[PDB]
């Protein structure tokens, strides 16, 4: 879909507001939140995997965050 390749990081931004800046500013985060709410099972598994793989709490937290963001994004 064309919708999966938005025009965000093109470095053309001016002071003028963009097409759906207000709408699309938080839509990705809202989608991730909704997906996490609807799929508590995958979040627990991701947390366990991040704790196991991550040596330190920074590595663990980063791995968990990245896994949780990726799971909806690939879908």
């Amino acid at each position: 879909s064309v919708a999966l390749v938005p025009h965000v990081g093109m470095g053309l931004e001016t002071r003028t507001e963009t097409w759906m800046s207000s709408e699309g500013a938080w839509k990705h985060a809202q989608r991730i939140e909704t997906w996490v709410l609807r799929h508590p099972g995958f979040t627990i598994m991701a947390a366990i995997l991040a704790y196991t793989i991550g040596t330190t709490y920074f590595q663990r937290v980063l791995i968990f965050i990245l896994l949780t963001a990726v799971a909806p994004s690939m879908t």
Partner: protein, 495 residues
């Protein structure tokens, strides 16, 4: 009061030894330039026009499929043949179906099937390109005098708009009673229209990146195309179905107008219905104040009584606008204006409307002034009937310094190195800063292209943590600074 009452109004003070100041004019923002013994002028870039566009590519957003036809060669005998596969306006697909004595062949394996349908375009998403030469800019210069012109019949008497194009570097604007103002802009560098595309999708237009435009996954035509039927990459808008491997079928995807609108998030909408009008972007201009004159010079001070005909109004820019009217003799005279302290000892305020003058006996002149923070007196007129107006300014000086720093940071965020010549007057420090900014911005744009604000914030937090947990002070400070800047950019980006 066009440039008054605009939130994105910026003050520029002083001119270089040559008496020029270079400014960056953005759509939606105005610049008020003021220098000693010079008139205060308001600059507003109000129109950007792109002329003689050329079609670069034509995308298909809605299609229809007809003349669907299938052909099959049963197992082990090769591939089916359709006369439609010779035509490039048919979309074709190959698949295998189960075949046997019941289907119509003499073997019992996976036969070969090909389905072809004729692809037709219903709605287009043309993309046009303009050359930087045909990039006329319109700028309106208004002498910030306290006298305004009612809409209609201005005919350049007060408020002059000048067309800036790459053809002529010097733009002369003759402002009556003020001499001539010479603009010297750089339209070839304001917006890199070479990398831009003017995308036009059904009475809406967007200014998109050329690479992003050419990476769209839709059927398209070369732009040089005339027949308009050899769409390529048609498989992005047609679906092929063989549910159980028993038969093959073709459907077209739905109208991609909404998906395209979603994809256009982050692109500034423009006008392309008639003229290719842009109302976004900036224009860096060098302002020649050499031949500029205060209109009220060689006037006598007004000795008569003044009256305020409209209560003092404070604007978003920390100033106050006072509408006074003269009731005295010697009508073409200059207004005695002062902003003193509560003891009337020191002069604490400055005039944005420098050298206010009375042109007619009963015409209201509205003066904009910058009062000091706290209590002060606005004193208008000579002693016999002098107006003693007391004013209060809410803010503090430290707060104003912080606000100025934040606005400068934001300007460095929307603009790149171009923010270093917004009010520059030569200067080795300015050039050094601009060069360092160019190098750093090159690195940053390389490292953060195609990334959303959430990704920038995450990366900034990670970099800041790496710096905070770094043994070396030099690397620690470098990483912390980079992370702070990246977090700030992610917070300020996507507007």
């Amino acid at each position: 009061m066009r440039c008054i009452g605009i939130s994105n109004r910026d003050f520029v003070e002083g001119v270089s030894g040559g008496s020029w100041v270079d400014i960056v004019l953005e759509h939606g923002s105005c610049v008020t330039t003021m220098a000693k013994n010079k008139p205060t002028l308001d600059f507003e870039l109000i129109k950007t026009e792109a002329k003689h566009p050329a079609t670069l590519r034509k995308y298909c957003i809605e299609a229809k499929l007809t003349n669907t036809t299938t052909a099959s060669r049963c197992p082990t005998q090769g591939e089916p043949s359709l006369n439609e596969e010779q035509d490039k306006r048919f979309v074709c697909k190959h698949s295998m179906v189960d075949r046997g004595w019941g289907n119509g062949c003499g073997l019992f394996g996976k036969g070969g099937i090909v389905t072809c349908a004729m692809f037709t375009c219903k709605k287009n998403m043309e993309g046009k390109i303009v050359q930087p030469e045909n990039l006329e800019y319109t700028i309106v210069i208004t002498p910030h005098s306290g006298e305004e012109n009612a809409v209609g019949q201005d005919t350049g008497k007060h408020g002059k708009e000048i067309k800036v194009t790459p053809q002529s570097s010097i733009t002369e604007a003759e402002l009556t009673g003020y001499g001539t103002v010479t603009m010297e802009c750089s339209p070839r560098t304001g917006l890199d229209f070479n990398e831009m595309v003017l995308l036009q999708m059904e009475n809406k237009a967007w200014l998109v990146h050329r690479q992003w435009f050419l990476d769209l996954p839709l059927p398209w035509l070369p732009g040089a195309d005339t027949q308009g039927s050899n769409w390529i990459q048609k498989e992005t808008l047609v679906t092929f179905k063989n549910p159980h491997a028993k038969k093959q079928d073709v459907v077209v995807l739905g109208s991609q107008e909404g998906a395209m609108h979603t994809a256009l998030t982050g692109a500034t909408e423009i006008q392309m219905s008639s003229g290719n009008l842009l109302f976004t972007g900036h224009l860096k201009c060098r302002l020649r104040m050499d031949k500029l004159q205060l209109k009220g010079m060689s006037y006598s001070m007004c000795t008569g009584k003044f009256k305020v005909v409209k209560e003092i109004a404070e604007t978003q820019h920390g100033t106050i606008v006072i509408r006074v009217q003269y009731e005295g003799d010697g009508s073409p005279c200059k207004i005695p204006f002062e902003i003193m302290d509560l003891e009337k000892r020191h002069v604490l305020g400055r005039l944005i409307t420098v050298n206010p003058i009375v042109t007619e006996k009963d015409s209201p002149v509205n003066i904009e002034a910058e009062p000091p923070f706290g209590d002060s007196y606005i004193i208008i007129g000579v002693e016999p009937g002098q107006l003693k107006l007391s004013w209060f300014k809410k803010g503090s000086s430290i707060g104003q310094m912080f606000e100025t720093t934040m606005r400068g940071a934001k300007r460095m965020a929307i603009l790149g190195d171009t923010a270093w010549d917004f009010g520059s007057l030569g200067g080795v420090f300015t050039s050094i800063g601009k060069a360092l900014h160019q190098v750093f911005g090159a690195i940053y744009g390389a490292a953060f292209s195609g990334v959303s604000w959430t990704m920038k914030i995450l990366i900034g937090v990670v970099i800041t943590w790496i710096g905070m947990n770094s043994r070396s002070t030099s690397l620690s400070v470098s990483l912390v600074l980079v992370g702070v800047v990246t977090l700030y950019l992610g917070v300020m980006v996507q507007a």
